[PDB]
Amino acid sequence: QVQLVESGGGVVQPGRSLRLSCAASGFTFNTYGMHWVRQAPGKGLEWVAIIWYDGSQKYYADSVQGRFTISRDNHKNTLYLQMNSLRAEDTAVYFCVRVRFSVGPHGSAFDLWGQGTMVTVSSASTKGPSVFPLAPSGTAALGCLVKDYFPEPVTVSWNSGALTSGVHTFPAVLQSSGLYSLSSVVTVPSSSLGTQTYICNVNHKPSNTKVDKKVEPK
Amino acid sequence: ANPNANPNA
Amino acid sequence: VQMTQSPSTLSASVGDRVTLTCRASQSISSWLAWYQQKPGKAPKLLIYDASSLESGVPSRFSGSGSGTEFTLTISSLQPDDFATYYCQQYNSYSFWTFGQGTKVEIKRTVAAPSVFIFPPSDEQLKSGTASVVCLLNNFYPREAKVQWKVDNALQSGNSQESVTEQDSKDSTYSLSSTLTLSKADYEKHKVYACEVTHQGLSSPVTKSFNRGE
């Protein structure tokens, strides 16, 4: 157990602030420079901030300067990221990252990464999805449209987990309303359409919405 | 190396 | 310093020798690291100082290069090496920047998609909106064109698409394209059509329906 564990993520409204924590364990935390690195949905990695092992030097990306403060409590083995004036382009997974130990004048690569905590900067309000059927017409396709929910995630299963093969539960797409939507589809033998029932089990924990929708052929 | 100088102890 | 990686994607088979390329916009000496990342998890350090193998990393990974040109080689691709690979500089006075990444995916035989179209359900229409969903099931490779036609006229900007990761069993992709209109706009027009082109298909495949039918 040499690990880093971030916490403090969630939904934040634009202009508001948020403090991320990173709990380090299994190594001598106060001898390591530490970083935060972020990754927006569907994109690559972006460096955010560095703090010296003793807190005596700090540097930040231009994109976050004057809004983000990095700090550390070496006696509690925690790293912090204080983010103010959060905007839509701060929406990302945030990783706390340890620099690989080096002797010499130069710093090194990133050798230890936490699991990441998601920060979503949106003014949308929590909302359970509407679940609509995708009715089928030797293979037939059917599915469920899971539309207009916030925030992520939703889980979708078929027939209480007894139907898994042929299931494609697509990643959510962010609509211009600021709400998410996705479809879950499955292919089945068309001979099974009148004889087997097909129910999609949708669960949206952030809003306590749980839907079982029967998908019937037209 | 300023920001890229060794940050460890 | 800006880092650029090529190709953005590449299709390889287990046992292939694969080389990924990374270029710095100005010299970074040998202050360059390679990372592996799979969906939903953190990056894993593979190579630092452009050529040094990180402690736990198997020997089929290696790296070389200095100045502005760098390469990551996997001597023999293995099933758990399919992932996105990032290079990253930490040159003196240069802060820390990453390449945009190279995704390594599983090569398999071409599979033309099966295509299904779905009119908006009665329930959705009752609620004020119309979504038309077009499904492309279990095709390879990823590249596909899905064009929506309404009243036999070509649309753009009113649809979005979503793609699965490579299927664990048969290495295919599946894709959805969703055309969203208001109830009123949808009831104005008559024919809704999904026209799919894919290199496995000798000619485009159109799935269409007539509103009401």
Q: Measure CB to CB from residue C33 to each of A109, A113, A182 and give the nearest one.
A: A109
Same domain, C99 and C144: no
Cα C28 to the chain's mean position, in Å? Answer: 29
Residue A150: what are its φ and ψ, rounded to 5°?
A: -160, 140
Q: Between β-strands A10-12 and A117-121, what pairing exists: parallel, antiparallel or unpaired?
A: parallel
- Angstrom distance (rounded) from CA C115 to CA A108: 50
CATH of the domain at A70: 2.60.40.10
State whether A91 and A169 are in the same domain.
Answer: no
Q: Say whether both A81 and A18 belong to one domain.
A: yes
Same domain, A114 and A185: no
Q: Which residue has the tokens 């690979």?
A: C85
Closest by Cα among C199, C166, C164, C193 to C179: C193
Last residue of a domain, one of C43, C73, C106: C106
Q: What is the 3-state secondary structure (H, E, C) of C136-187?
A: EEEEECCCCEEEEEECCEECCCCEEEEECCCCCCCCCEEEEEEEEEEHHHHH
Which residues are within 8 A (CB) of A32 and not within 5 positions of it... i.e. 6 or more apart? A53, A98, A99, A101, B7, B8, B9
- Nearest CA to A147 out of A135, A127, A130 is that of A130
Distance CA A34, CA A49 (A): 8
PDB experimental method: X-ray
State the nearest Cα–Cα gap between C117 and chain A, in angstroms.
Answer: 9
Tell me which of A98, A121, A144 is where a domain ends: A121
Q: What is the CA radius of gyration of chain C?
A: 23
| Residue where one domain finishes, among candidates C106, C123, C141 | C106
C49, C135, C139, C163: which to substitute to probe chain A, counting the most A Cβ within 10 Å?
Answer: C135
The encoded tokens of residue C45 equal 């350090």
CA-wise closest residue to A156 among A194, A105, A112, A209: A209
Backbone angles phi, psi at A146, to 5 degrees: -110, 95
> Are C85 and C149 within one domain?
no
Under 8 Å between Cβ of A138 and A191: yes
Query: Which H/E stretch holds residue C123?
Result: helix C122-127
- Coil, strand or helix: which one is C132? strand
**Which residues pair with residue C24 across a beta bridge?**
C3
Q: Determine what percent of chain B falls in helix, strand and coil, rounding each to the nearest 5.
A: 35, 10, 55
**Which tokens hold the place of A170?**
């697509």
Can you tell me the distance from the alpha carbon of C176 to that of A213, in angstroms, rounded to the nearest whole number?
Answer: 20
Q: Do C98 and C171 meet the contact criterion of CB atoms below 8 Å apart?
A: no
Label residue A105 exposed, middle or buried (CB < 10 Å: 0-12, 13-18, 19+): exposed
Judge if C100 and C121 occupy the same domain. Answer: no
Other chains touching A, judged by 3 or more CB pairs under 8 Å: B, C
Task: Give chain C positions within 8 Å (CB) of B8.
Answer: none
Q: Spell out the SS3 assignment of chain A.
A: CCEEEEECCEEECCCCCEEEEEEEECCCHHHCCEEEEEECCCCCEEEEEEECCCCCCEEECCCCCCCEEEEEECCCCEEEEEECCCCHHHCEEEEEEEECCCCCCECCCEEEECCCEEEEECCCCCECCEEEEECCCCEEEEEEEEEEEECCCCEEEEHHHCECCCEEECCCEECCCCCEEEEEEEEEEHHHCCCCCCEEEEEEHHHCEEEEEECCCC
CATH number, domain at C160?
2.60.40.10
Structural domains counted in chain A? 2
Give A166's contacts (C-beta < 8 A, 6+ positions apart): A186, A187, A188
- Same structural domain for residues C98 and C21? yes
Same domain, A7 and A112: yes
Alpha carbon of B1: minimum distance to chain A alpha carbons (Å): 7
- Report the C-alpha gap between A28 and A64 in whole angstroms: 28
- A141 and A116 in a common domain: no
- CB-based contact A145:C160 (threshold 8 Å): no
Domain that holds residue C83: 3-106
Bond preceding residue A189 cis, omega within 30 of 0: no
Residue A162 has a CB neighbour count (10 Å cut-off) of 8
Same domain for A147 and A92: no
- Report the b/e string of C61-91 with b at 16+ CB within 10 A: bbbebeebebbbebeebeeebbbbbbbbbbb
In the block, tokens 């004057």 appear at A66
* C95·B1 Cβ contact <8 A: no
CB A79 within 8 A of CB A68: no
**C114 contact A CB<8A:** yes
Do A109 and A135 share a domain, yes or no?
no
At A139, phi and psi to the nearest 5? -110, 135
Are C75 and C148 found together in one domain? Answer: no
Q: Which helix (H) or strand (E) segment is C125 a member of?
A: helix C122-127
Residues A59 and A13 in one domain: yes
Q: Is residue A46 within 8 Å of residue C98, measured between CB atoms?
A: yes
Judgement on whether residues C123 and C96 belong to the same structural domain of the protein: no
Domain that holds residue A165: 130-214
**Domains contained in chain C, number:** 2
Among A121, A150, A178, identify where a domain stops.
A121
CB C147 within 8 A of CB C195: yes
Domain termination residue (choose one: A61, A87, A121): A121
How many angstroms separate the CA of residue B6 from the nearest CA in chain A? 4
CA A106 to chain centroid, in Å, comes to: 33
Cβ-Cβ contacts under 8 Å, A105 against chain B: 1, 5-6
Resolution of this PDB entry, in A?
Answer: 2.2
Minimum-distance CB partner of B3 among A53, A54, A59? A59
